[PDB]
Design a protein around this ligand. Structure first.
Ligand SMILES: O=C(Nc1ccc2c(c1)CN(S(=O)(=O)c1cccc(C(F)(F)F)c1)CCO2)c1c(F)cccc1Cl
Ligand code: NA
Lengths: 250, 10
């Protein structure tokens, strides 16, 4: 059904590097150059206070819509990924439901500034205190710490491309019907990522990558915090939360 | 519903 569902040659692995990097380039929601330029554009003490004074439900809704928009670009990235559209729909949905949020969490390090511990949010950079109204300080600080640790790796756009391809194509996701097909596609993407690192003398980052349990913890923490919020404001979830967000998380 | 729609829309 696809060349990457079988053993690929070196030349075919080189093509895969280029294909993933291209799919990533085209599905970037935010340009790296725009993100770095915006670093000096920081929310004022008054803007911070204004976000903090927003009701818990209002803040949750704004964050849910922004997450949804990020997810939309990840679905497009998946569709453009070699072999993804050749998997069955059950498997595509299994991969996106378990991995979309994980991809968004990795992509986030680009919009995060390790210098002053700020993140790009609604046009400006702000510290974690910006999200205080959400009432999930442990999750937010765990998200800022993850972005901080990925920032210290100084990933290129091509490294993010390949590492995110691998975050999504995980043959271990519960519910995959064509597991062996996912295993071969995963093997080839692993080879494409490790090949690119070898060629660019960047293999030293492999031991530095976060353990898989780290992305899972962040994802389980998001699911848990959403359950607490849903109990408090069930009609907010039902009436004002985006349908794609709910399909993925509830 | 949405995920299905996004995957099928080319
Ligand atoms: O916000 C949550 N999940 C989330 C994760 C990644 C994301 C987005 C949302 C969407 N964002 S954003 O709202 O512009 C933004 C920008 C920067 C930092 C954050 C921060 F810290 F909140 F994660 C958010 C783009 C970055 O990708 C979240 C949470 F943490 C707790 C409860 C409920 C929710 Cl919805
Ligand atoms: Na960064």
């Amino acid at each position: 059904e696809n060349l990457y569902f079988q053993g690929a040659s070196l030349t075919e692995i080189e093509h895969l590097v280029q294909s993933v990097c291209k799919s990533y380039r085209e599905t970037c929601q935010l340009r790296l150059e725009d993100l770095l330029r915006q670093r000096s554009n920081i929310f004022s003490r008054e803007e911070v206070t204004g976000y903090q004074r927003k009701s818990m439900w209002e803040m949750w809704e704004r964050c849910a819509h922004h997450l949804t928009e990020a997810i939309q670009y990840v679905v497009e990235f998946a569709k453009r990924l070699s072999g993804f559209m050749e998997l069955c729909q059950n498997d595509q949905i299994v991969l996106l439901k378990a991995g979309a949020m994980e991809v968004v969490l990795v992509r986030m390090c680009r919009a995060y500034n390790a210098d002053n511990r700020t993140v790009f949010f609604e046009g400006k950079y702000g510290g974690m205190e910006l999200f205080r109204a959400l009432g999930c300080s442990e999750l937010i600080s765990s998200i800022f710490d993850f972005s901080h640790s990925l920032s210290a790796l100084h990933f290129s756009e091509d490294e993010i491309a390949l590492y995110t391809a691998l975050v999504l194509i995980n043959a271990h996701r519960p519910g995959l019907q064509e597991k062996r097909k996912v295993e071969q596609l995963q093997y080839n993407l692993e080879l494409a990522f490790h090949h690119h690192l070898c060629k660019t003398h960047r293999q030293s980052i492999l031991a530095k990558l976060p353990p898989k349990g780290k992305l899972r913890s962040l994802c389980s923490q998001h699911v848990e915090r959403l359950q607490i919020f849903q109990h408090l404001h069930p009609i907010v979830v039902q009436a004002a939360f985006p349908p794609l967000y709910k399909e993925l998380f509830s | 519903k949405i995920l299905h729609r996004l995957l099928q829309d080319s």
